[PDB]
């Protein structure tokens, strides 16, 4: 999706301001919002890819105005309704519709174990690898309205495969209920000149981006 979230290469966002001695949580409500993510993922209410795409789909202005955890809060209030875990009414009233009709999967007993384990996206088998490290590749020019992980600033550009990380889930399909379609993921190296042009570039600088096999084609 060619949305405001795809920031790579944009101008006008200004200086990187950095709060000195910044706390993990600047406000208390952030703690609630942050801890909700693992709780809901554990329920299987939605997967992480649907999560990202829910944020990509909020209003461009709301995305820019909102602090980070407002992004998360938006997903919880909207993606939960889309998935049919909540109703728009329940979410508006604040009051549930029929009481305690589910049981939390994330219980105190398993918190540490879950957080320490996580959920790798790596998979045993998938599409065969078409490329080898050293290969020159060009990122396909694609513009899906749905979820994708090929940044806008890379499309059409030529790079060099530097790492083959193995087989992984494909977010493009996982975010839209089309399965995992596992395939190889490569780290591709682009020169500063190739991405930004002769003027806006530095001779020594390179940019590395992780792209799925079918994002690419032989140069």
């Amino acid at each position: 999706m060619n949305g405001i979230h795809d920031t790579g290469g944009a101008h006008g966002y200004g200086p990187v301001y950095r709060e000195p001695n910044e706390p993990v949580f600047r406000y208390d409500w952030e703690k609630t919002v942050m801890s909700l993510l693992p709780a809901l993922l554990a329920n299987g209410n939605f997967n992480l890819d649907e999560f990202r795409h829910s944020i990509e789909r909020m209003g461009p202005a709301h995305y820019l105005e909102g602090t980070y955890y407002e992004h998360w809060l938006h997903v919880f209030e909207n993606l939960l309704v889309e998935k049919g875990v909540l109703t728009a009414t329940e979410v508006a009233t604040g009051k549930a519709a029929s009481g305690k009709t589910a049981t939390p999967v994330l219980t105190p007993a398993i918190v540490d174990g879950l957080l320490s384990t996580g959920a790798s996206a790596a998979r045993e088998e998938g599409a065969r690898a078409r490329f080898a490290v050293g290969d020159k590749v060009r990122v396909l020019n694609k513009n899906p309205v749905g979820h994708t992980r090929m940044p806008r600033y890379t499309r059409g550009k030529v790079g060099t495969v530097v790492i083959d990380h193995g087989v992984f889930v494909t977010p493009d399909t996982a975010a839209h209920g089309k399965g995992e379609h596992p395939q190889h993921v490569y780290t591709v190296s682009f020169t500063s000149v190739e991405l930004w042009g002769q003027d806006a570039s530095s001779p020594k600088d390179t940019i590395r981006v992780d792209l799925w096999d079918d994002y690419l084609e032989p140069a």
């Binding site: 709060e19 209410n45 980070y68 604040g94 320490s116 992984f168 020594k204």
Partner: protein, 201 residues
């Protein structure tokens, strides 16, 4: 000239109420467990942070065998020190050299190595850093008081997939026979992101 989109702007006046309302709703429906959520908060408030990565770096500095293992398999490497899990399942460690300076970013959102660095700072998740880091690394780094030699290559790693990156900083000069513990105190969060260098003695 207030903050607007750099991640430090003010939240809505009613945000806490909205959050409290959704929480109550989710608990009422039996979707979340307050006690478990407290454990999640504690974990990232008090147990998981940059001190982890610091221990990793320090150990790699003194132990060449460990460094080799770490660079061959980041996930196993950090596990040797008891670090692992969410947002760190597939680690790749980037070694800074006299020829190469590494730094990572997530242009698309906020992807970041939780197990070793903890949760990311607001600036890492915001537009200014994410937008500019891939086009003008040096310009951004200069804002952090870090100037890279012109002849030294900068490698910006964009976290677009499920790999998570952590930078292994170069060991400061004049730190001979320093203990692992004393070396770890030199390793800042910034030095492990690539937006800074380890403290100099």
């Amino acid at each position: 000239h207030d903050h607007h989109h750099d991640g430090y702007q003010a939240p809505p006046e009613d945000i806490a109420l909205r959050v409290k309302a959704l929480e109550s709703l989710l608990i009422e429906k039996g979707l979340v467990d307050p006690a478990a959520m407290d454990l999640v908060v504690q974990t990232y408030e008090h147990k998981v942070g940059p001190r982890n990565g610091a221990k990793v770096v320090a150990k790699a500095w003194v132990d060449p065998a460990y460094k080799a293992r770490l660079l061959a398999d980041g996930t196993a490497g950090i596990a040797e020190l008891g670090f692992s899990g969410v947002q760190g399942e597939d680690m790749v460690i980037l070694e800074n050299t006299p020829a190469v300076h590494n730094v990572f970013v997530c242009t698309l959102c906020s992807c970041y190595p939780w197990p070793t660095l903890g949760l990311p700072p607001a600036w890492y998740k915001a537009a200014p850093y994410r937008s500019r880091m891939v086009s003008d690394p040096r310009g951004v780094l200069a804002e952090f008081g870090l100037v890279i030699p012109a002849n030294k290559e900068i490698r910006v790693w964009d976290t677009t997939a499920q790999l998570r990156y952590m930078v292994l900083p170069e060991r400061p000069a004049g730190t001979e026979a320093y203990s692992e513990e004393q070396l770890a105190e030199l390793v800042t969060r910034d030095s492990m992101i690539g937006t800074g260098l380890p403290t100099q003695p």
